Amino acid sequence: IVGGYTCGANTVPYQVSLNSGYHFCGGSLINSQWVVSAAHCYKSGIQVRLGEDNINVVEGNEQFISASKSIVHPSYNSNTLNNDIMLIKLKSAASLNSRVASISLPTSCASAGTQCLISGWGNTKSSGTSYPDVLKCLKAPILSDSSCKSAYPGQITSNMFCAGYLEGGKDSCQGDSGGPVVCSGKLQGIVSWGSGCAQKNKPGVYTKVCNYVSWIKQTIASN
Numbered sequence: 295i296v297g298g299y300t301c302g303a304n305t306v307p308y309q310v311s312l313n314s315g316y317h318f319c320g321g322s323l324i325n326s327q328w329v330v331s332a333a334h335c336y337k338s339g340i341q342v343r344l345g346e347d348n349i350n351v352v353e354g355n356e357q358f359i360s361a362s363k364s365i366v367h368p369s370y371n372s373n374t375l376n377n378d379i380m381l382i383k384l385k386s387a388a389s390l391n392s393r394v395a396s397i398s399l400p401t402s403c404a405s406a407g408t409q410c411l412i413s414g415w416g417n418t419k420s421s422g423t424s425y426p427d428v429l430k431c432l433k434a435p436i437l438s439d440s441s442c443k444s445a446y447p448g449q450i451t452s453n454m455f456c457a458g459y460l461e462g463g464k465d466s467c468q469g470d471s472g473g474p475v476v477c478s479g480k481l482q483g484i485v486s487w488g489s490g491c492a493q494k495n496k497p498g499v500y501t502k503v504c505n506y507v508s509w510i511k512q513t514i515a516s517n
């Protein structure tokens with residue numbers, strides 16, 4: 295997260311870190327046994343780390359659980375990143391509490407101008423690589439579809455939306471991918487892609503979760 299702030303330990307209880315010996319992507323807990331992340335964050339050997347703040351220090355509250363299976367969306371396109379969503383089933387259910395809680399799925403899509411909270415342990419520099427130990431937060435609005443398509447002509451599908459600041463300076467970045475975009479307490483987006491981080495007129499693009507609620511529910515119900 296570039297231009298953001300320290301969230302505060304466990305103030306984002308649904309945030310998870312996907313780990314394979316290092317943190318590579320974020321994700322969101324939606325119930326005690328399933329996490330939603332981005333399809334391009336898929337790899338085998340994933341350990342989901344819940345209740346984290348400093349990802350390099352066991353401070354207490356952490357629960358490390360192995361993924362039993364990862365389900366990348368069948369229509370995920372790695373060249374366009376269209377349908378960039380994946381569900382991860384945990385080997386055992388997590389113990390929920392105030393520090394580890396799930397976030398709700400939306401019932402309707404959000405409108406432009408909605409202010410949302412984006413969080414993660416991704417890079418904090420626009421130019422260079424500086425990864426933080428603790429969780430960073432950023433409040434950012436959903437942009438209009440016309441501004442998004444103007445920024446990324448020909449690359450935005452109806453399963454994506456832009457959020458951020460066109461002036462640059464504040465944005466999500468590498469390492470934040472797969473993590474949550476929460477608006478009014480509902481999970482509306484997943485950190486997906488953008489051109490660089492915090493560049494002027496190049497906002498972040500997020501997977502539009504409201505278009506996948508039936509898919510998520512049906513997939514969880516049959517697995």
Ligand SMILES: NC(=[NH2+])c1cc2nc(-c3cccc(-c4ccccc4)c3[O-])[nH]c2cc1Cl
Pocket residue numbers: 318319334335465466467468469470471485486487488489490491492496497498499500
């Ligand atoms: N808001 C943005 N401008 C942005 C920049 C990103 N940059 C990345 C990114 C860059 C290189 C590698 C990865 C990566 C993907 C999968 C696994 C590990 C790293 C990224 O997510 N993801 C990004 C996601 C966003 Cl939304």
Ligand SMILES: [Ca+2]
Pocket residue numbers: 346347348349350351352353354356
């Ligand atoms: Ca820790």
